[PDB]
Amino acid sequence: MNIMLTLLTNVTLASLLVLIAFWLPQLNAYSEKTSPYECGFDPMGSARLPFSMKFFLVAITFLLFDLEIALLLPLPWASQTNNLKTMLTMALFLLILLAASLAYEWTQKGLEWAE
Amino acid sequence: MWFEILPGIAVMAACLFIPGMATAHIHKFTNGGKEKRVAHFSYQWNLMERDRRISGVNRYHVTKGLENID
Amino acid sequence: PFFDVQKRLGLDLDRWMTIQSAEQPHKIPGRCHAFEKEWIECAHGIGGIRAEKECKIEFDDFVECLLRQKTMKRLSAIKRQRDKLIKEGKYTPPPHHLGKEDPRP
Amino acid sequence: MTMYIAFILSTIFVIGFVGFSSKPSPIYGGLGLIVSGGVGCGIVLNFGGSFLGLMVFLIYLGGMLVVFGYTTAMATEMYPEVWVSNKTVFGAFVSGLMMEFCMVYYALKEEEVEIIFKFNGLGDWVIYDTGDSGFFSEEAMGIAALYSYGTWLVIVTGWSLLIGVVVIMEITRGN
Amino acid sequence: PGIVELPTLEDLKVQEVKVSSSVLKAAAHHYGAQCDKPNKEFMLCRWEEKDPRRCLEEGKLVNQCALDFFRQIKRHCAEPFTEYWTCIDYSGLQLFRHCRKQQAKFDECVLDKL
Amino acid sequence: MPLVYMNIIMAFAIALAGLLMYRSHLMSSLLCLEGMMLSLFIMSTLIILNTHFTLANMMPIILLVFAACEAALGLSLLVMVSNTYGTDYVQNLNLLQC
Amino acid sequence: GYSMFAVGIGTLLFGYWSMMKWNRERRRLQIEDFEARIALMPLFQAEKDRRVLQMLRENLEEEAIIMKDVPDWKVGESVFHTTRWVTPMMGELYGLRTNEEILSATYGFIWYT
Amino acid sequence: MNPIIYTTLIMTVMSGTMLVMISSHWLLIWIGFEMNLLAMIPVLMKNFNPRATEAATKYFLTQATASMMLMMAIIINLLYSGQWTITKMFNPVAMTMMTMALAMKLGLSPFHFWVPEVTQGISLQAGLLLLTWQKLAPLSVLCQISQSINPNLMLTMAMLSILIGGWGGLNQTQLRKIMAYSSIAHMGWMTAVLPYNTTMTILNLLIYITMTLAMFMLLIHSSATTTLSLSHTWNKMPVITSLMMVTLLSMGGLPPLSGFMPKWMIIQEMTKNESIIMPTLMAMTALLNLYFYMRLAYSSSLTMFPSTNNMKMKWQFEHTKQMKLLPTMIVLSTLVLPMTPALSSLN
Amino acid sequence: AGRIASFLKNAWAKEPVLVASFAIGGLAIILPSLSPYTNYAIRINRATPYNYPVPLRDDGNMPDVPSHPQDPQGPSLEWLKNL
Amino acid sequence: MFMINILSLIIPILLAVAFLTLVERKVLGYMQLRKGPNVVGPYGLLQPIADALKLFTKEPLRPATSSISMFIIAPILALSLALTMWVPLPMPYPLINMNLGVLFMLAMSSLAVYSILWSGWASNSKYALIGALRAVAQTISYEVTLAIILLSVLLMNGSYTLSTLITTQEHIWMIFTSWPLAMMWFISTLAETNRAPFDLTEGESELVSGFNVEYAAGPFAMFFMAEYANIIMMNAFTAILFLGASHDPHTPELYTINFVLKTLALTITFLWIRASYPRFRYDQLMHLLWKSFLPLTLALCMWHISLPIMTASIPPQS
Ligand SMILES: CCCCCCCCCCCCCCCCC[C@@H](O)O[C@H](CO[C@H](O)CCCCCCCCCCCCCCC)COP(=O)(O)OCC[N+](C)(C)C
Numbered sequence A: 001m002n003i004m005l006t007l008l009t010n011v012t013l014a015s016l017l018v019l020i021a022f023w024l025p026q027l028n029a030y031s032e033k034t035s036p037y038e039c040g041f042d043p044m045g046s047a048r049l050p051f052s053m054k055f056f057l058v059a060i061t062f063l064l065f066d067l068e069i070a071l072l073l074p075l076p077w078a079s080q081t082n083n084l085k086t087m088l089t090m091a092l093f094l095l096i097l098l099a100a101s102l103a104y105e106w107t108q109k110g111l112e113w114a115e
Numbered sequence B: 001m002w003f004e005i006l007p008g009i010a011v012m013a014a015c016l017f018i019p020g021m022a023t024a025h026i027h028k029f030t031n032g033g034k035e036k037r038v039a040h041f042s043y044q045w046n047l048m049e050r051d052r053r054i055s056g057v058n059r060y061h062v063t064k065g066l067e068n069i070d
Numbered sequence C: 001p002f003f004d005v006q007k008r009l010g011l012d013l014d015r016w017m018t019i020q021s022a023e024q025p026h027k028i029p030g031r032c033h034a035f036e037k038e039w040i041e042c043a044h045g046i047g048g049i050r051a052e053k054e055c056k057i058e059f060d061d062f063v064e065c066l067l068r069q070k071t072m073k074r075l076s077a078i079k080r081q082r083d084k085l086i087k088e089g090k091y092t093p094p095p096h097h098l099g100k101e102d103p104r105p
Numbered sequence D: 001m002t003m004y005i006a007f008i009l010s011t012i013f014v015i016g017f018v019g020f021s022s023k024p025s026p027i028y029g030g031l032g033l034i035v036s037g038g039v040g041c042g043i044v045l046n047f048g049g050s051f052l053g054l055m056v057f058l059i060y061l062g063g064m065l066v067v068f069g070y071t072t073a074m075a076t077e078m079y080p081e082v083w084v085s086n087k088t089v090f091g092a093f094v095s096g097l098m099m100e101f102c103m104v105y106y107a108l109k110e111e112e113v114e115i116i117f118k119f120n121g122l123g124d125w126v127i128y129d130t131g132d133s134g135f136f137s138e139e140a141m142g143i144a145a146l147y148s149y150g151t152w153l154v155i156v157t158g159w160s161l162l163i164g165v166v167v168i169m170e171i172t173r174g175n
Numbered sequence E: 001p002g003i004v005e006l007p008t009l010e011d012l013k014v015q016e017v018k019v020s021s022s023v024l025k026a027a028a029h030h031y032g033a034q035c036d037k038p039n040k041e042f043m044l045c046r047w048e049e050k051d052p053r054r055c056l057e058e059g060k061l062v063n064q065c066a067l068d069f070f071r072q073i074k075r076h077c078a079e080p081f082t083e084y085w086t087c088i089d090y091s092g093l094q095l096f097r098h099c100r101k102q103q104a105k106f107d108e109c110v111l112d113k114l
Numbered sequence F: 001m002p003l004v005y006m007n008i009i010m011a012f013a014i015a016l017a018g019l020l021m022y023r024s025h026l027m028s029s030l031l032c033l034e035g036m037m038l039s040l041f042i043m044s045t046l047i048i049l050n051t052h053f054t055l056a057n058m059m060p061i062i063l064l065v066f067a068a069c070e071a072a073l074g075l076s077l078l079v080m081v082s083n084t085y086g087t088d089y090v091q092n093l094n095l096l097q098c
Numbered sequence G: 001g002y003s004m005f006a007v008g009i010g011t012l013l014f015g016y017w018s019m020m021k022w023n024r025e026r027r028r029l030q031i032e033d034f035e036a037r038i039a040l041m042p043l044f045q046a047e048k049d050r051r052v053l054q055m056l057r058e059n060l061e062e063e064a065i066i067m068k069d070v071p072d073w074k075v076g077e078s079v080f081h082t083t084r085w086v087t088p089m090m091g092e093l094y095g096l097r098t099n100e101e102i103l104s105a106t107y108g109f110i111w112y113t
Numbered sequence H: 001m002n003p004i005i006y007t008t009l010i011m012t013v014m015s016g017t018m019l020v021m022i023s024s025h026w027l028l029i030w031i032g033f034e035m036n037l038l039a040m041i042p043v044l045m046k047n048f049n050p051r052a053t054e055a056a057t058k059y060f061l062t063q064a065t066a067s068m069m070l071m072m073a074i075i076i077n078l079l080y081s082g083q084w085t086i087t088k089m090f091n092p093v094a095m096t097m098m099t100m101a102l103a104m105k106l107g108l109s110p111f112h113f114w115v116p117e118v119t120q121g122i123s124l125q126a127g128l129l130l131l132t133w134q135k136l137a138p139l140s141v142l143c144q145i146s147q148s149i150n151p152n153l154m155l156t157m158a159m160l161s162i163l164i165g166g167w168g169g170l171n172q173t174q175l176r177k178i179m180a181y182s183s184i185a186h187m188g189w190m191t192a193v194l195p196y197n198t199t200m201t202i203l204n205l206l207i208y209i210t211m212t213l214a215m216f217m218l219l220i221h222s223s224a225t226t227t228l229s230l231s232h233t234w235n236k237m238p239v240i241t242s243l244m245m246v247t248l249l250s251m252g253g254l255p256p257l258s259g260f261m262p263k264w265m266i267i268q269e270m271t272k273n274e275s276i277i278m279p280t281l282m283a284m285t286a287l288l289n290l291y292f293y294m295r296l297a298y299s300s301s302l303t304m305f306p307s308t309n310n311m312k313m314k315w316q317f318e319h320t321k322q323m324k325l326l327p328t329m330i331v332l333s334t335l336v337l338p339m340t341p342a343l344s345s346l347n
Numbered sequence I: 001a002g003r004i005a006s007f008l009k010n011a012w013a014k015e016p017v018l019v020a021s022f023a024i025g026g027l028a029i030i031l032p033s034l035s036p037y038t039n040y041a042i043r044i045n046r047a048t049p050y051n052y053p054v055p056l057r058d059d060g061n062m063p064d065v066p067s068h069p070q071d072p073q074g075p076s077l078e079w080l081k082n083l
Numbered sequence J: 001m002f003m004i005n006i007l008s009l010i011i012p013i014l015l016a017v018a019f020l021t022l023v024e025r026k027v028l029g030y031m032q033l034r035k036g037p038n039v040v041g042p043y044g045l046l047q048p049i050a051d052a053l054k055l056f057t058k059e060p061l062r063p064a065t066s067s068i069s070m071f072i073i074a075p076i077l078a079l080s081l082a083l084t085m086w087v088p089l090p091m092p093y094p095l096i097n098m099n100l101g102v103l104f105m106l107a108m109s110s111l112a113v114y115s116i117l118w119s120g121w122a123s124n125s126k127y128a129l130i131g132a133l134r135a136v137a138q139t140i141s142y143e144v145t146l147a148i149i150l151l152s153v154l155l156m157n158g159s160y161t162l163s164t165l166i167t168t169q170e171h172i173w174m175i176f177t178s179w180p181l182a183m184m185w186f187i188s189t190l191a192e193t194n195r196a197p198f199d200l201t202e203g204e205s206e207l208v209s210g211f212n213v214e215y216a217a218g219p220f221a222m223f224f225m226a227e228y229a230n231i232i233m234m235n236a237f238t239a240i241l242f243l244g245a246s247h248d249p250h251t252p253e254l255y256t257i258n259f260v261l262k263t264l265a266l267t268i269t270f271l272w273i274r275a276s277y278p279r280f281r282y283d284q285l286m287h288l289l290w291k292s293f294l295p296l297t298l299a300l301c302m303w304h305i306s307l308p309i310m311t312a313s314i315p316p317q318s
């Protein structure tokens, strides 16, 4: 309830700042003024054209590695279990395979950006 | 200077003092002056609700000692 | 189809997680532990065909604990009759259901 | 009954689902899925699952960032579509909104079996358990039990993640 | 399915222990030392009968023993206990480790007088 | 069942309809697939919290994990499709007939 | 080279020793306040039993008053075949009560921050 | 692909299937399906080309949709009963969703559309794996929940699968699409008897797998993927075409060949349940599969098609790689009818 | 014998970060199996009373079960204080 | 009375951001052998006010090719999230007390990147697009390593409650037990707040202004208020994690003063670093985070899991 009120307050403050920015000053808008900026000149193509990604394989790998974060954040609570030998084996096993997957991608040139 | 940077740092530090001190003072003001209760687990929440029920004024921070058991 | 390796080897790969009444951490009970325990003990060893007929009482109680449909219907009926009575003014709610009770620890 | 905060959150969940399922440009679909993830985190938090809601929100934020990059790389066109720039997209959006409205009306004003079973309302607060004990969180204990009870789950999950790295390496090889 | 049997409001009445949680926490160790027998009997009834309606008299005995314990404390030395639980009550998490001097005084009092 | 359960089930149905009813972009369909996974996560979490079944508090997390795998898998395939055609349009996947 | 590493490992070992001592003390203190809770638990159990029973009895009396005109309604009739005690659903405890305390009993602990 | 990586992926596919078939928990069955699919996608793309990429994309979309539906059915079943064990579904809606998901995974009609295309888009070894090993897990799950299945829906899908397999196979000149339509018809035959007797389902699965392995190995041996390419094999390896013709006759179900034994055992079983119209229609429809098998045998072995001059060079070389289990597979695909009572060992 | 020494020298010269990572990970794997305080950690974890200790009904045949918390029988946390 | 606390939090943060602009300008000036702002007010104390008044009375332009909805939403999201990041921080008492405050910070930080992404995309200009894609790359570089570092550090805290970090460090700063991690953590924060040498999404000398090149006046000012508030917030979080100030329950102002001094030191260190080093290349940042930071972080996570069990030093509060 307090967090909802906090979020509402922050969003309202930012929205009123935007309203003040757009309604206080004098506006003199024309087409030349509102045209796209490319440092002196009209853009040759569209900015909506495909922009190639050279780190696409690392982006996919980040998705799998981000879920390894999901599996390891319960570790502080897992250290409170009675059978510590089992959890330590499984906690270490999970980090070893993450290290092996990083080693596999590193050796197979997966971390190198496309030329 | 180099000590003319200090007034800006002093203004920044004065501004950054306000949140913590204000939170502490507001907590004391709305909790009978004794450090607003922390309920991380349902047992602490149960203790707070029992305190509120037995206060008689619907406020947990109103504390009843040995003078309430005749 | 089902090659039952676990029981042959006594391995317990996933049976620890199948039911609500099976060895939770810190002995935390399920919301319907007693109902599921009763239904499982009723249906044990007699087969699915016989259990669907002869343990229908236990299973119905377990389902009622799970979803609480009959409880919600009964509460709705009580609330509807109370609202009907209050609108005409025949019935007046007591102080302790209006926030004026004497609380106890 | 109780301020119907959870009902509002679930309705916004459905609205964001309709937003990304009407399939505008994947920029706006990603935004809709982000909104759905946030409100789903809120829904789960209102039922006591703080860790699960926060983690699903974090995971979907990362996934939508990768999707945004991939959309800029491979799913753009000259004029990306919004919900009002296309008759098909607008029609799907409005149809989803209206059929959500129809389900909500027919469920709360009278009690009907839509597809599976029925519903009367009464708010979520009825189905709570009022248990009073504990110096811990049951959700945290159950999740942390994965390292003592769920050894088999850890094994299969880790193997699948390693194999997934190898698989994405193989698929994008080309040649 | 049958009628659920419930106790009347009269036999649910008891002399309540009307002290706050900080007072209870301050007294808890000696309370668990002294009032062990009725509390254990009640909790055995509780986990055996699995029914709150079947262990009401044992709960009443629990209340009575707690009241006797607190009355005895109030009779012998109330001031050290009051300072101790005030120090306990100040803490937002109600920490024992922040009030060791008052706890020592209370323990010495209850050891010498009781 | 409460309105929230039917709202989550409706969200799943909407995402499944979005997946089954295609438009040009394959990425939009992948987003619908991820939405179905999200709705399944929410529904299973709500059931497990409501019934206080402690040991399945871990299964939605595992669910999430395999969701990622699917996502990764799908994205990988999309890359190859794009590298063949310059677009991710599902129309281009018509070399194979019935 | 050697000196920097030596100082780093020395600092790490000093920190490890200090934190080992402090964490063992923290575990002892946690055991102590857990024991305080264990000592206090039976009284809370007794009061909770009485509170739940009184709320159920008040609901039963009000339902007896309200449902006297409906013909085929049994006062206090269970929905379960079994006769053993079923822990009351919180909707039954607060069904005939005001909205604010229902919000309390439902979301007070979750919303308390 | 590296051979070690290929072996790892194959063993991961097999491990997913084994996880499905040894699990008692619905979540582990779902995980087995996910692992199988994840390892299966790269195997389809081992020989990289646009057609393989399209086939892999279609396969993944189909299987991922089926997996979503399967998890939804699991969650509904859990909601109406706090059960994770795979015994018998407690909710009919959940049962319908699970049946549809498993039919989509198997490729039963009307979810058969992907089976020909994918089979056409991949290599012959990938097609062998896809049409033999990929059927085990969904069929095992269906066998475990057989008592819960609604007979009307399953039988409708089975009859549709048989009809569509025959009709679609009638139109094909490519051998991989012929094998796919044959697979759809055989899957319909398998799922028709499932509500009555799972042992008959297992027997049909084993027989179909044996004959399919024989045909795929014979097609790999004579590296032909079209009818006209296979029409050259008589001028290089007549024994291969003779064996293929006999195996094709067996697949059509003609007695005294082995392929007759499953249908014979299924129809008979159905008659123990007062089912006559469906078995009669099923046999009369399997006549279509027999027809296009016979057409392939006409073009391949019973007549001699014109050949090419360069075939003379192929006369001077032997086959470098030998298939150890091809002779056993052919013999099992043809001469096992007299051992029919041994099926009692399958229950 | 000397080959591994040269390989380690080369790895320390070129990629010290990986050498340090492998050394730390190896120590993390091996050292817990040789530590006498792992069992102490298990005992400390088992000594934490999260839930209520439910009493046992006296049957007249329980010599090792205390009748009171301060009775000498039962587990003792003396080892924990001196730690 | 809670809204009074909300205001007493958010307003002083904005004043601190305004005067941090001045402090950074003067610190860079004196490290560059000049003075910086000293005319507009005594010692430039009125310069932030003049800058804000100039920016909010200047005309904001709506680009012709832009998508207006996200173009307006992104600065609002940035500023509101920057303000929201402060509510669970204990100074020594938090405004919002959470069981999982660290996870809340992680999730909100992960959400704040979409402000830059959506502003850059909705600007519909090439330089803004390049800045947005660099933001994508930067998050991919730092996120996993930062999360694992935070987990390894908190393994000794015993929970994700921020206030517990005060109790954990009552006798020694945690930086004496995990100074390697802190090292990388510090660099990670530099990458997380888009600060030099990792100010790639901005890159004045490479892409004029990067993602916010099309922004002017008020929304532009909002983007900088968000960025500087994030700088202060991340440095305060680092001070809580690694430099534990002793807290007295009866005199919390001592803790507040000590905390503010430590946070100021870390912020001045950020300004110093900006004054000292050249800029990274954005693939070099990815290689630094994935080939050096990640392996060491994984090894140290293993070590920090094993260490409390080996030495029988597991923290309380499961
Ligand atoms: C820190 C954040 C919180 C701050 C707290 C205050 C929040 C303020 C909210 C933000 C708005 C303030 C901006 C300041 C200027 C006002 C802008 C606007 O409202 O005024 C004019 C509003 O005028 C309208 O256009 C027409 C006037 C009447 C319209 C009918 C509305 C109902 C009024 C009926 C009058 C009857 C009596 C009402 C009083 C009792 C717009 O004129 P316009 O030229 O376009 O735009 C350029 C504005 N310029 C000239 C200043 C540069």
Ligand SMILES: CCCCCCCCCCCCCCCCC[C@@H](O)O[C@H](CO[C@H](O)CCCCCCCCCCCCCCC)COP(=O)(O)OCC[N+](C)(C)C
Binding pocket: A083, A085, A086, A089, A090, A093, A097, C011, C012, C013, C023, D148, D149, D151, D152, D155, D159
């Ligand atoms: C028969 C063929 C053998 C060889 C081929 C095996 C193929 C499968 C791979 C490994 C099979 C694992 C089966 C064992 C299941 C683990 C569960 C059981 O063994 O007990 C656990 C024993 O766990 C041990 O740590 C053993 C796990 C170590 C295995 C990790 C590495 C080996 C996997 C290698 C193959 C996997 C894929 C490749 C990975 C690189 C935990 O016991 P405990 O906690 O006391 O008590 C539980 C009851 N409580 C909770 C109520 C107290």
Ligand SMILES: CCCCCCCC/C=C\CCCCCCCC(=O)O[C@H](COC(=O)CCCCCCC/C=C/CCCCCCCC)COP(=O)(O)OCCN
Binding pocket: A096, A099, A100, A102, A103, A106, A107, I008, I011, I015, I018, I019, I020, I021, I022, I023, I024, I025, I026, I027, I029, J294, J295, J296, J298, J299
């Ligand atoms: C037993 C415990 C194991 C678990 C702990 C490990 C945790 C995580 C650590 C591993 C993370 C992933 C490792 C990734 C491996 C990288 C492979 C690689 O590609 O190496 C080459 C470099 O070659 C090397 O690998 C470096 C040397 C060989 C590996 C490093 C040493 C291996 C172990 C040495 C320490 C052994 C223990 C210490 C002994 C101390 C003395 C008693 C990379 O360089 P390039 O980018 O290709 O070059 C281009 C620019 N020049």
Ligand SMILES: CCCCCCCC/C=C\CCCCCCCC(=O)O[C@H](COC(=O)CCCCCCC/C=C/CCCCCCCC)COP(=O)(O)OCCN
Binding pocket: G008, G009, G012, I017, I020, I024, J175, J180, J181, J182, J183, J184, J186, J187, J197, J238, J242, J273, J288, J292, J296, J303
């Ligand atoms: C008994 C068991 C104990 C366990 C082991 C403990 C000992 C561990 C010993 C090693 C610890 C080293 C930790 C340091 C981690 C990073 C080291 C590293 O290698 O990073 C550098 C690069 O890292 C950097 O230099 C960062 C660049 C940006 C610098 C920005 C400002 C500099 C920092 C200012 C001061 C930092 C203060 C941090 C603490 C703040 C307090 C919280 C590698 O990059 P390259 O030199 O290019 O070579 C690799 C590829 N060939």
